[PDB]
Amino acid sequence: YVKFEVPKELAEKALQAVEIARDTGKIRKGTNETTKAVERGQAKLVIIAEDVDPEEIVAHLPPLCEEKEIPYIYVPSKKELGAAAGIEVAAASVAIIEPGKARDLVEEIAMKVRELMK
């Protein structure tokens, strides 16, 4: 379900955005609230771990985000995504609803992702 190669640098910035939005804004953890946020257009950025297994758990997110035109990016570790999201365990996906202080960072990420997709 990984549709493009994310530079290590950009992935770290996405984890930074999640950390910041976590402390200063509003984020959703887990595929259920992430999916719902995308469908309702509430998500400003969706972060998806590349190591989810079964894949079916998050496989629907890339196509859904494209269908709804919501920015999305992959991070290599669900463990680190969960950590950035504030939990000690893995998080398959996260949705940033309110960037908080990460408003600009999210926009930079969305812009760079737009290019990766061409």
- Tokens 């570790």 found at: 77
Q: Which residues contact 87 (CB under 8 A, 6 or more apart)?
A: 29
* Residue pair 1/28 in contact by the 8 Å Cβ criterion: no
Q: Say how far apart CA 32 and CA 57 lie, in whole Å.
A: 10
**What are the structural domain ranges in the chain?**
1-118
Beta bridge partners of 72: 46
The method recorded for this entry reads X-ray
Classify residue 76 by burial, with Cβ atoms within 10 Å: 0-12, 13-18, 19+.
middle
Q: What is the resolution of this structure in A?
A: 1.9
Query: Which tokens belong to 80?
Result: 């680190």
Q: Which residues contact 4 (CB under 8 A, 6 or more apart)?
A: 74, 113, 116, 117
Q: Say how far apart CA 116 and CA 31 lie, in whole Å.
A: 23
Beta bridge partners of 118: none
> Cβ–Cβ contacts within 10 Å for residue 116, how many?
14
In CATH, the architecture of 1-118 is: 2-Layer Sandwich (3.30)
